[PDB]
From a paper:
The core particle of the proteasome (20S CP) associates with ring-shaped activator complexes to degrade protein substrates. Alternatively, the 20S CP can associate with the [name] ([name]) and degrade proteins in a pupylation-independent manner. [name] monomers feature a four-helix bundle fold and assemble into a dodecameric, ring-shaped complex with the protomers arranged around a large central opening of about 40 Å in diameter.
While high-resolution structures of truncated [name] have been determined previously using X-ray crystallography, the conformation of the full-length [name] dodecamer in its unbound state has not been addressed. To confirm that full-length [name] in its unbound state behaves similarly to the previously studied truncated [name] constructs, we determined its structure using cryo-EM. The cryo-EM map of full-length [name] was resolved at 3.2 Å with local resolution ranging from 2.7 to 3.4 Å. Similar to the crystal structures published previously, our model confirmed that the [name] protomer forms a tight four-helix bundle. This demonstrates that the first 35 residues are disordered and emanate from the [name] face oriented toward the CP α-ring in the [name]-CP complex. Comparing this structure to the structure of full-length [name] determined in the absence of substrate, we could not identify significant differences within the dodecameric [name] ring itself.
Residue numbers in the entry:
A (entry chain K), B (entry chain L), C (entry chain A), D (entry chain B), E (entry chain C), F (entry chain D), ...: 36 to 140
Write the structure that this text describes.
């Protein structure tokens, strides 16, 4: 069912909270080259961790939605904001959807 | 009936939340070329995912309402805002309408 | 009666929500040529969809009230604001009127 | 009686809401030539629609109060604001008066 | 008595609401020549309509209080504000006085 | 007694409301020559109407307190503000005093 | 006793309210020569009216406290503010004192 | 006792209210020479009136605390503020102290 | 005990209120030479009055804490603020301490 | 289970509070070279302490997510903000996840 | 026990309140040479008074924490702020700690 | 257990309150050389006092976390802010952790 989609919810929740805090921090003040490089590395590793904790259906959905960054160029602040906002929105919708079914029962 | 139109509501809800978060992010600060290119790709893939989760009637309605972006040019920030606002409004109306019938019962 | 005028309320409600969100987006920030062209296309298609969901009496009333845009020129932001405000006001009044009768019963 | 004056209240209410929304939109931001031309056309058609929905007594009262625009010149923003404010005030008073009698019963 | 002074209260109430809305509109933003000419015409016709709905005692009182505008000159914004404020205040006092007696009973 | 001093309270109340609204209007924005001339004429006529509605004791008191304007010169905005403030204060005190006795009973 | 000091309270209350309104008006905006001349005349006449309504003890107290203006010079705004503030404070204290005794009973 | 110290409380209360109102007026806006001269005269007469209404113990205490102004020079605004603040504070403390004993009983 | 330390509380309370009001007045606006001279004289006399109303233990404590001003120089505004703040704080603590014991009983 | 993952919760909670306070301090005002060097040393030692208090599964997860700083260069303020925000978000998610299970029981 | 540490609480409380008021006054506005000299003298005498009212354990603790000022130089405003803040914090913690034990009983 | 870690809680609480007050004071306004030297001395002595009041486990943990300042250079304001923020956060976490266990019982 809908609840069976999320394999382990705690890992997904903590990765989502980490990504949301990073997005808030980036929106707070502008970054520089090294900060954005670290941010891209975090984005890649966090997406991998999130995929490890999801069902294959949602793994494929998230793979279709998200596009990995180009490793040869340093992303700008706006690109990182777009990627993090997309991922935060997707997770916020996922948890809202599963909790809708949970509250329905 | 009205509720039978939405095939799987959870996917639609999470795609809508993702699109709303992206719209808020874009309204927050201006973007650049690569950010808008990523935004156009997200818009196309998200519309496809949304259509995969709707009835053929609503699929055709949304196809009539929404126009795909031109792949040969980078859309400006205003065009992306218009498209995302149109889609967010359409989904907000769709869920309001279906929940009106649900509350009616 | 008054309730029988609205053939299918869900479609009208969601088109109204889409148009209202687009009006808010246009009021938020100024647009450019392509954004206004897309906005005019959305306006035409949305009026057609709204007419498809109304009784012939209200179809004729809305036809008398609304004037289609000139396809040979790009409307300014103010003209689009005027048209969207007129349509949003008309729909807001329509639903208020029908719900007055519904609450009366 | 007072209630028998308003032939069909729903049409009057929705035309009033449309006119009020247009007035708010015009007060929000300044208009240009084409916007004001569209606004004058809306004003004429809306007054005709409103008169079609009123008793002959109120039709004559509204005819005495309102003066049609000159078709040979483009009205300024202030003239349109004055006309719309006058019509909105007249309708607000009309509904307040009829609802006073309704609440009296 | 005091209540018998107001012949038909609904017409007086709606004319008062129209005049109050026009006063608020004029205080909102400055006007130009044509707007003030329309405003003078509205003022004259509205005073006539108000007098048609009052007792001869109040007709004479209002005639003593109010002075018709000069038809040969365009009144300034301040003169129109003074006239509309005087009339709005007089009507606000009239209704307050009659409702004092009504609440007394 | 104190209540018998006010011959007809409704006329006094409505003249007081008119004068208070005019004072608020004058405080809102500055006036010009014609506006102040109209204001002086209103002041004279309003004082006469107020005196017609008061007992001879209060007529003489108000005559001692108030000084008629010079008909040969246009009063400045400050003089009109002073006169209107004096009259508004006197009426506010009069009604407070009579209502004190009324509440005492 | 304390209550027997105030001969007629209504006249004192209304003169106090008039003086307080005049003080508020003067504090609102600066005055000119004629306004201050009218203000001095009002001050003299109002003090005489207030004295006519007080016991001889309080008449003498108020005479000691208040100093009449020089009739040969136009008082400045600050002098009039000082005089009006002194009189308003004295009356505010007088009524507070008498109402203390009234509430004591 | 403590209550027997205040011979007549009403006079002290009204003189204190007058002095407080004058202090607020002086803090509101700056004064000129004649205003400060009037203020010094008020200060002297008010201190005498206050002393006439106090016990000999409090008379001597207030005499020790307060120093009369020099009659040969016009005090500055700051000196008058200091004197009025000192007297207002002393009276505020006096009444607080006596009402402490009154509430104790 | 703690309560027996304060010989007469009313005098201490009113001197404290006077000093607090003077401190607030000095913080409000800057002073000049004569104002500060008067302030120093008030400070000396107020300290003497406060000492006359305290037990010998608290007299010696306050003597150790407070240092009299130099009579040969005019203190600056900051020095007077420091001295008044020290005295206000000491009195605020004294009354808090005694009321702690009073509430304990 | 989920609760058994956190070996000792008190140490993790206090290290998280320390890191959060440091992040708030860094966001408050900009730092200099020595402050950032101290901050990097604190970051390394705090990560080691946090790892000492976590299960091997969470140790490996946090190792994958976090990247140690380069010891040969002084990180900029933005890099330190990014690292601290990532760690604060991860801990906030971890505790939210474990408390979800605790509240579930 | 913890309560036996504070020999006499009233003296400590009033010295703490005096020091807190002085700190607030110093933070309010900048000081000059003589004000800071007086402030240093107050600081020394107040520390001695506080030590006279504490147990030998807390006397030694406070002696270790606080460092007396150099008598040969005038401390700056920042040094005095640091010293007063340290002492206020120490006293605030002391009373919080003792009241924790008191509330525990 | 967790509560047995804190040897004497009152001393730790008061040292923490002192350090927090000093941190707030430093954040309030910038310091100079002597203030920062005094601040470094306070920091060293306060850390020693805190260590004297903790268990050997927490002593070693705090020793690992905190690095003593260099005695040969005057720390900048930012370094002192970082150190004080780290210590305040560590203590806030420590007390939160111990009170979690206390509330658990």
């Amino acid at each position: 069912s809908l609840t069976d989609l999320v394999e382990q919810p705690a890992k997904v929740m903590r990765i989502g909270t980490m990504i949301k805090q990073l997005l808030e921090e980036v929106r707070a003040a502008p970054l520089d080259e090294a900060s954005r490089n670290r941010l891209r590395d975090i984005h890649a590793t966090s997406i991998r961790e999130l995929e490890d904790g999801l069902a294959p259906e949602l793994r494929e959905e998230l793979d279709r939605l998200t596009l990995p960054f180009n490793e040869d160029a340093v992303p700008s602040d706006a690109e990182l904001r777009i990627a993090q906002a997309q991922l935060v929105g997707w997770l916020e919708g996922l948890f809202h959807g599963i909790q809708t079914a949970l509250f329905a029962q």
